[PDB]
Amino acid sequence: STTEDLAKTFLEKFNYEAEELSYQNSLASWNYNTNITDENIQKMNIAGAKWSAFYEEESQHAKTYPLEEIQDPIIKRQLRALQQSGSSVLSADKRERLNTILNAMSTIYSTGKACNPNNPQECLLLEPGLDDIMENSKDYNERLWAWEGWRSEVGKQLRPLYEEYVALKNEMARANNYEDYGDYWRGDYEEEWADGYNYSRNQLIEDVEHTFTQIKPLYEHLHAYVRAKLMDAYPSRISPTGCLPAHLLGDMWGRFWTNLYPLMVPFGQKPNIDVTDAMVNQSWDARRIFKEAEKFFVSVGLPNMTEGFWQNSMLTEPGDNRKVVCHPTAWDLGKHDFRIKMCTKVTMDDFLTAHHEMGHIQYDMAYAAQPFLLRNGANEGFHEAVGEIMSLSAATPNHLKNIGLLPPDFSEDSETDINFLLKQALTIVGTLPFTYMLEKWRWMVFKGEIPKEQWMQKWWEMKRDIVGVVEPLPHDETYCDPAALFHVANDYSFIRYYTRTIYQFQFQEALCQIAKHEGPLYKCDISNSREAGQKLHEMLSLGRSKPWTFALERVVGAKTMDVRPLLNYFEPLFTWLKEQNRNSFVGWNTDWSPYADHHH
Numbered sequence: 001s002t003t004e005d006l007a008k009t010f011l012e013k014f015n016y017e018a019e020e021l022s023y024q025n026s027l028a029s030w031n032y033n034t035n036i037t038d039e040n041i042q043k044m045n046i047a048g049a050k051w052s053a054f055y056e057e058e059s060q061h062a063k064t065y066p067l068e069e070i071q072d073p074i075i076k077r078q079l080r081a082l083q084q085s086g087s088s089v090l091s092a093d094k095r096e097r098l099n100t101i102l103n104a105m106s107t108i109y110s111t112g113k114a115c116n117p118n119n120p121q122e123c124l125l126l127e128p129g130l131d132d133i134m135e136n137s138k139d140y141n142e143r144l145w146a147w148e149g150w151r152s153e154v155g156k157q158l159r160p161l162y163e164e165y166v167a168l169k170n171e172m173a174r175a176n177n178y179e180d181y182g183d184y185w186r187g188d189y190e191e192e193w194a195d196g197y198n199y200s201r202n203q204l205i206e207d208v209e210h211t212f213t214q215i216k217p218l219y220e221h222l223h224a225y226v227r228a229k230l231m232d233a234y235p236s237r238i239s240p241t242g243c244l245p246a247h248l249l250g251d252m253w254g255r256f257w258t259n260l261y262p263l264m265v266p267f268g269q270k271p272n273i274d275v276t277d278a279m280v281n282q283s284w285d286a287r288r289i290f291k292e293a294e295k296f297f298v299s300v301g302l303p304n305m306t307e308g309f310w311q312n313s314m315l316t317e318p319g320d321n322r323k324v325v326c327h328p329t330a331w332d333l334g335k336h337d338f339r340i341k342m343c344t345k346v347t348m349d350d351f352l353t354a355h356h357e358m359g360h361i362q363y364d365m366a367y368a369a370q371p372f373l374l375r376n377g378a379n380e381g382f383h384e385a386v387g388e389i390m391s392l393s394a395a396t397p398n399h400l401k402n403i404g405l406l407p408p409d410f411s412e413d414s415e416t417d418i419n420f421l422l423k424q425a426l427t428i429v430g431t432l433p434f435t436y437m438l439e440k441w442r443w444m445v446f447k448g449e450i451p452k453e454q455w456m457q458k459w460w461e462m463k464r465d466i467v468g469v470v471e472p473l474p475h476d477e478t479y480c481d482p483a484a485l486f487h488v489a490n491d492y493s494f495i496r497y498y499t500r501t502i503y504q505f506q507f508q509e510a511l512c513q514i515a516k517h518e519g520p521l522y523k524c525d526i527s528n529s530r531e532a533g534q535k536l537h538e539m540l541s542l543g544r545s546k547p548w549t550f551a552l553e554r555v556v557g558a559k560t561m562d563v564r565p566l567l568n569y570f571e572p573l574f575t576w577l578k579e580q581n582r583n584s585f586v587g588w589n590t591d592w593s594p595y596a597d598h599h600h
């Protein structure tokens, strides 16, 4: 009769149908990831077709029920998520063309090669060959031709495809009643109605801009320390007051600075804590690693893994030449079928990864009772934030002593802690300006504030100003350097890596006060605190049933993202960096470049 009554029955039928078809799609995809065979690609592709064809029919039919006539919030949330459409709103020719461009850009990125200018037979793909150069080489000229060749040979192919990509995607978003494709992506953070828990799409822009201005002091001192250490690694190549050359940052793009750590170890005589040998000396195996990760979550008041987890997960590589995807992943297939697939080895890195991935499973187990459409993180950044904080506590010397991987008399060393915090900052802090500037450029491109004749001009002006990074060779508009990163060429939003990092330290600081942690935040271990786990479970069980502002408030008492917990975590490093940069310039001029030696 009423519109809300009709939609309530519609959503119930949808949930049970989606439960069955999505389960078969996840099961088929799982059977491929654990048994790579052409047949398993076919059965996986059939499962994706039925599930996608079902979702398109149900999404269109959801538009029959006007939201204005729906009053219940839970029915309203499910309906809105289902009414949201994508490429289907375009006419058939524009829809076909966009799919053709998406496939083209993806295959160019995964099959494009750059050839060695000195050895023209050596032409390398990115993922094996070019990454190896950009992640391990210490030679200025070898990193240069890999950085330049990847953008001149592959990036220039993507430039005309990306220009049509922006126009077609902008039309798709506007037909969905958004301003542009950037406003469309920022809808992922939109929360529509509540008791002040609302969140406009424009609010994400301000919160990102506001939190970033507070990051800049810490980043500049990290930038200043890295610069002084890179001048020694590359003599006469880097200006002491200028920007960092883009091809010397540890990867193809400067996304993370982790691989610069061996060039700038604060105290090279102190080795970092590595409990691999203690694991091997105590005869640990992959099963013990996940039993210990399971024990950790039990210590904080969370349940054990299900019987299905232990019987169906692939915790080791099979080794009968069953070709397998070894990327560590946590699977919620539905129907309370939780599995982890990772080729675990007896190391400390996989030990930390096991806690990280099981944290994903704990999240999945928590919101299992929610309706189908509401079984996800509060927003796109919550799941990885929950997983990361698990790795923070499990890696602490306090937690390693309690499980017997460190001696009971183990004494902590500040120089060792500084080595730990710097390596963390090269990964965590170094990526925040990169991520923020990349998404800002995309947002401005989608909006039209950067015309096509200025794409590359504004790319490197923003790279210089915001990131303190300078291109080693001048790039005109025949280039498309942003498209040379996976997430840009493969049509993935990128701001999630920014927000996830803010969220995870908000979670950590909140739970560490509940866990009664005294002292610096980076030493906190939430182990054995059932109050910390019970508070976190309050939010995990919400899934996506409540606004993400509400879910964030339940753990940390604040309704919006706050970078001060992040700065608090790195405050001991901030103090050490400021004293190390006393005789070094902090900041950068945007006038210098390696193709032009001028400071004004």
Ligand SMILES: *[C@@H]1O[C@H](CO)[C@@H](O)[C@H](O)[C@H]1NC(C)=O
Pocket (backbone or CB within 6 Å): 035, 037, 039, 040
């Ligand atoms: C792997 O796939 C092949 C072909 O699809 C199949 O014959 C085999 O039984 C599978 N192995 C396992 C362990 O599922």
Ligand SMILES: *[C@@H]1O[C@H](CO)[C@@H](O)[C@H](O)[C@H]1NC(C)=O
Pocket (backbone or CB within 6 Å): 196, 197, 198, 199, 200, 203
């Ligand atoms: C919620 O809506 C009010 C109404 O104008 C607005 O002032 C406020 O900024 C909104 N909150 C968020 C987080 O967007």
Ligand SMILES: *[C@@H]1O[C@H](CO)[C@@H](O)[C@H](O)[C@H]1NC(C)=O
Pocket (backbone or CB within 6 Å): 298, 302, 303, 304
């Ligand atoms: C988890 O399993 C262990 C081992 O049997 C058991 O002692 C413990 O009580 C279990 N915890 C929960 C919450 O079920």
Ligand SMILES: [Zn+2]
Pocket (backbone or CB within 6 Å): 356, 360, 383, 384, 387
């Ligand atoms: Zn993760």
